[PDB]
Structure formats: C-alpha cells, structure tokens
C-alpha cells in the first residue's frame, strides 16, 4: 500500500514538463508520498491513451494529466475516475471529462500580460503584430487577450497583423518576415507559441530589423538563449511549478476524502486554478533553464 | 503522513462583511476543516452590518493583532485595498475569497467564476427543457457578477442551443418583490416561456411565486445561492435547481494558501520564480432535491 501519484504527459521528454514534475516532486516531498512520471514520448494521441491505460492498471493514488488535445483522451480519463482514481488536469485541459480540476494558464490573461509588457517596451505607442496558431483554443485566447488589451487600453498602439505561424518555427519566421515587409515600421511582435518566438527572432535577424521588440511564450532553451542575448525582449513562462505542486495537493486531498463530509455541500475540488504567468527577461532568465 | 502541519500558535483570521449571514457559515467550516488538517487555529471576524469602514476597522483590529494570515471577503472592489495593502507590507499573508478587490496587494482570489455559473445554468436549463423552448433571465444589471451570470447563460443558449431562445432579460431589482413582478411580466408577455433563470437569490423566490400564482405547470425554474427560502422551494419542488457557490472550498483552500504563504512553501529556487495561484474557481454546484439537504445550515 505505497501511496504513489503519477504525472502523465505527451512528448514526455520536453523540458517544459520538467518543472511540472519538479513541482509535483516538491509537493510529494512535503506530503511524504511517492510520485512517478510517465507519458507519450511523442505527440501521438494513441501513445498517450496507451500510456494512461497502463498507469490506471497500476492503481495509483491519483493521476495528474496534461491532455494532448481536449477530446481524444477523455474516455480514458473517465475510465480512471470510474475506477475511483482521483484525476486532475494540468497544462492542457480536457474540459468534457470527469476530471475534478484543471490547473493551468489563463490564456486570455496571459495575452493581456503580453500586451501590458509590449506597451511597457514601446512606451504605449506603435504598431504591433501577433503570430499565432489559430488551430487551438488556448492560443486564440492568448491572441484575444493581447489584441483586446491593445484595443481597450493603448489607443496610441495599433494591431496591424495577426499571422498564422502554424505552430512551426519556419512558418512563423515566414509570417514574421511578411509582417516586417508589409509594415516596415512595426515595433513589436507577440508570438503565442514557442516555435513562434524563435521563428520571428530568426526573421528579425535575417532582415536586420533590430528595432522590433519580440515577446514570446514558454521557456524552451533556445528561447531563453534568445532572451539572454537580447534578441527576445521577454517570454511568458507558464506556472508549471504551480501546476505540478497544486495538482499533487489536490490529488492528495481527494485520496483522503477531506472534501466529502456531511458539512461541505458536495462542492469537491475547485474547478480551476490559475497557475499564473511570469514575464521572463534578461533579469530572471537564468532562473528558467532546466 | 504529510509534513504539512503547524501548531495552534498560528493564528489565521477570516474576515467577512455581514458576519451572521448563513452564507459565510460554510466558508468558516472550510476554514476550520483546513485548520484541523494543518493543526492550526482559526478565528472568524468581520463587519456586523453592511458597512464600509466597519469592515475597515475590524480589519485593522486583526492586522494590529499580528495574525499568521488573513482570508478576506471584500465588501466591494475599489475599497479595503489600502487597508489590505498595508497588511501585506507588514508581512501578513492575505488572500481574498467570495468577493474580490482585484487591485489590492492580496496574493490570490478564491471565488465563483460567474460566467461559467451562467453557462452551467444554460446546460442545466437545456437539460430540463430538452434543448427546446423560450427562456428568460431575471437579474440585476447593477452588479458585474450578475452580468457575467446573465452573459454566460444567454451566450450559451445562443451558441449551443438553436432550438431555445432568450425572450427576456428582466431587471429584478434584487428583491423578491420586484422579481415576482418581473416574472409575472415574462409569464404574461410570453405565455409559452418554459424556463426562467434568476441570477440573484431573491430572484428565485419572486419567480417561484409568480409561477404558483398563475398555476403555470411546465415552467422550469433555476435560481442562485442557498438561502433557506430558496432551498426549501427546491425541496418543495417550486424551483427545479439552484446554483450553489463553493463557499466551503473558499474557506478550506484560502487557509491552505495562507499556510503556504506564511511558511514560504512556494520555493524561490528551481520554481520558475512562481507566486501563489492568483485565482481559484471555487466552483458551482447544481442543487436539486437529490442534494438540497447538504446545503442547509
């Protein structure tokens, strides 16, 4: 009867997940419980449903999962809940599932923060653009938070383009080059996806458009290197330690039915925890390498 | 066994703004159930009446008494910030629950997502109405949380149910008197309305009353909060469901957060320099008679 909590991911070796696992382990070391890290080694939906099945089979005390996409993991999550396994989602949600909580970025507010940061860098004036993936809801919320904040709070700034970077570094570089050639006086570009910041940094280096302020997303090594050398002014770090930490805190809590007595009015776990965003600049970039 | 324990000498305070209200009692029980899991002590304070500076003064009483942290429900947005902001400077952890002062130096807000509350009301309404029929909303256009509940409901009916239509959003002026009359207007102006959603606790009584008054049969009513009057109506059948805010969650996780803040458990090393989660959606529960019992005092 060893109390073990499992974290399940996709593209499991990415550095992003390491601080999630770190916050999980930090919670476990304070709770004196075991944790284990598993996941699809690749962006393969089938692989993640198979890895998640094996985890449930091992009958863990609870699972914290980041779902590759909102739907294609849901039936397996419910499988775990119906077998009595506490389940919370972190990072990437599956809102249609029986998971008791989601702990992750408020993507709209993240976009708001990028606008506020972009305005800081531009003294609240100038043309700005966005490179995004219109594929997914979470990136559209980042885009919307940025654009709406420009519209409502910085009337001397203008959003001149929202480009489709296709979640790919090369398509993002090409989109950024189109932005810079179409609006040569653009002063800032925000990328809602990691491959976007590298792509537009590569565009800005190729065109020698050294006066453009770049804001990117996430803390991949190649992004942080660009922050370190001044090519990217800031990147937005998701609260991955908070995700792992409060995921375990919530899971540990359900496994001990401390939230299901007679005087609590059902309720159960909080439905959502905003794990926050950190603006990463040259001043704190060193804190974010893996 | 976990190492997340303290001792009774740690004094955390809950602070409200209409102390005796039945609403805050499950806030307290969450607070107390967390205190017991953390082996810490908790004290309930807050304004006797609906009073701005009275709340300001009870706060000063507890900040001057050096507590290990304060959980606060703020009377309004642009208020208490300067008073709470000083509590942070003195080094006291302070989170907010139920009602938010978003411009303050408080580290987190734990409260209802009012838009998704309205979305849930729409799914619940669609449920009872098999995704077909005319529906109305009785709300306060005065407060933002009611606007978000309204907006969540109406937009979900638009986007997700084309066989349904919002035929009226009434002003129920926040009392059962005026809500009964807005409900009567809706039932008169639209005799085939099949559901009404009230975003304010007094809305539910007022429309339960209008429906009874007209001997209207198939009208599905969804109200808000868990006042005794409302819960009774849910148990008696006049109200199909009421939406309960997660007040126990507010207290329990408020204290978890103050405990983590007081003991500086959100590491600054290898943590990506994180802070406390700034928002916790303490959730909404659909109260039908299958669980109305769990929500009385």
């Amino acid at each position: 009867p060893d109390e073990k909590y499992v974290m399940v991911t996709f593209q499991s070796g990415m550095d992003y997940w390491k601080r999630c696992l770190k916050g999980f382990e930090d919670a476990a070391e304070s709770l004196n419980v075991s944790v284990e890290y598993r996941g699809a080694t690749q962006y393969d939906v089938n692989e993640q449903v198979t890895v998640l099945e094996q985890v449930i089979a091992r009958k863990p005390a609870g699972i914290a999962i980041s779902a590759i996409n909102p739907t294609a993991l849901t039936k397996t999550i419910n499988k775990a809940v119906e077998e009595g396994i506490p389940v919370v989602l972190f990072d990437s949600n599956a809102s249609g599932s029986k998971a008791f909580s989601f702990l992750g970025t408020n993507n709209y507010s993240a976009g708001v923060t990028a606008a506020h940061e972009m305005a800081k860098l531009l003294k609240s004036e100038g043309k700005v653009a966005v490179i995004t993936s219109p594929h997914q809801l979470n990136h559209q919320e980042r885009t919307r938070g940025f654009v709406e904040t420009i519209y409502q709070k910085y009337p001397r700034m203008q959003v001149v383009a929202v480009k489709n970077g296709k979640g790919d570094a090369l398509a993002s570089k090409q989109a950024a080059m189109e932005v810079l050639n179409d609006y040569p006086d653009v002063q800032g570009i925000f990328a809602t996806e990691a491959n976007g910041g590298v792509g537009m940094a590569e565009a800005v280096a190729e065109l020698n458009k050294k006066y453009v302020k770049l804001i990117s997303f996430d803390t991949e090594k190649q992004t942080l290197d660009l922050v370190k050398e001044g090519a990217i002014a800031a990147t937005l770090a998701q609260g991955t330690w908070n995700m792992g930490y409060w995921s375990l805190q919530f899971l540990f809590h359900l496994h001990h039915h401390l939230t299901s007595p007679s005087r609590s009015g059902d309720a159960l776990l909080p439905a959502y925890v905003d794990t926050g965003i950190t603006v990463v600049t040259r001043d704190n970039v060193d804190h974010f390498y893996a």
Side-chain angles (χ1 to χ4, degrees), chain A:
Chain A
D2 159 70
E3 186 171 355
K4 200 168 75 177
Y5 296 83
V6 177
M7 170 176 289
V8 179
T9 63
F10 53 91
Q11 297 183 280
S12 56
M14 290 283 166
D15 282 13
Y16 177 86
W17 310 117
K18 294 188 198 319
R19 190 147 52 245
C20 296
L21 184 57
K22 195 275 200 273
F24 217 50
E25 295 178 350
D26 278 0
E29 290 164 18
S30 178
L31 296 164
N32 302 313
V33 302
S34 271
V35 295
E36 185 190 312
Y37 181 80
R38 291 217 241 152
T41 74
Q42 298 252 45
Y43 198 85
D44 193 41
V45 179
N46 183 236
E47 193 192 341
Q48 200 187 12
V49 312
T50 308
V51 179
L52 179 50
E53 283 160 7
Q54 308 165 226
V55 175
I56 302 161
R58 299 282 210 97
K59 316 301 175 177
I63 318 178
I65 308 162
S66 171
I68 183 144
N69 54 42
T71 78
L73 207 79
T74 293
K75 233 178 289 181
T76 324
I77 291 162
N78 305 333
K79 198 201 179 302
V81 184
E82 299 156 6
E83 308 199 347
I85 300 181
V87 168
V88 300
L89 309 170
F90 75 96
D91 173 57
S92 305
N93 198 7
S95 89
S97 80
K98 276 164 183 174
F100 300 95
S101 201
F102 174 62
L103 297 94
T105 299
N106 174 331
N107 283 306
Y108 183 93
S109 305
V112 179
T113 295
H116 288 308
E117 186 60 26
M118 189 68 85
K120 175 164 103 165
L121 298 161
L122 295 188
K123 319 183 84 169
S124 304
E125 157 195 311
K127 303 176 179 167
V128 295
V130 180
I131 298 168
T132 187
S133 320
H135 322 333
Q136 307 86 354
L137 163 80
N138 56 309
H139 291 111
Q140 185 197 272
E141 284 298 276
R142 294 173 190 176
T143 298
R144 195 166 68 87
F146 184 86
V147 170
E148 290 191 8
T149 297
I150 301 299
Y151 289 173
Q152 318 165 343
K153 305 300 193 319
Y154 303 109
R156 290 174 276 124
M157 303 178 71
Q158 182 167 74
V159 189
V160 302
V162 181
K163 299 291 285 205
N164 177 6
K166 297 203 269 240
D168 161 62
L170 260 177
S172 296
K173 165 174 160 167
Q174 193 219 21
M177 295 208 278
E178 295 164 353
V179 171
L180 295 160
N181 290 318
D182 291 356
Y183 315 83
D185 60 341
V186 63
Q187 288 186 58
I189 312 170
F190 171 45
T192 67
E193 211 254 3
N195 302 329
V198 167
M200 54 186 199
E202 292 164 354
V204 152
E206 188 148 296
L207 298 181
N208 258 273
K209 303 285 279 186
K210 50 189 227 175
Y211 285 98
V212 186
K213 307 302 211 176
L214 304 179
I215 300 187
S216 192
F217 226 91
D218 287 320
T219 66
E220 295 178 346
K221 177 185 173 300
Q222 59 265 44
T223 301
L224 297 182
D225 295 338
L226 291 161
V227 177
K228 205 160 186 56
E229 72 210 37
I232 299 184
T235 187
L236 296 197
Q238 299 196 66
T240 47
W241 185 89
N242 280 340
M243 287 171 212
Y245 189 84
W246 293 103
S247 286
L248 211 178
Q249 290 283 254
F250 277 16
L251 285 173
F252 172 96
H253 175 92
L254 276 188
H255 189 250
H256 300 211
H257 311 288
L258 210 67
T259 195
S260 231
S262 154
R263 251 202 265 137
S264 76
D266 305 26
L268 304 143
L269 277 190
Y272 172 64
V273 173
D274 183 345
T275 44
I277 282 282
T278 307
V279 186
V280 180
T281 69
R282 265 169 143 152
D283 295 348
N284 55 349
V285 67
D286 284 331
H287 310 219
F288 293 88
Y289 286 93

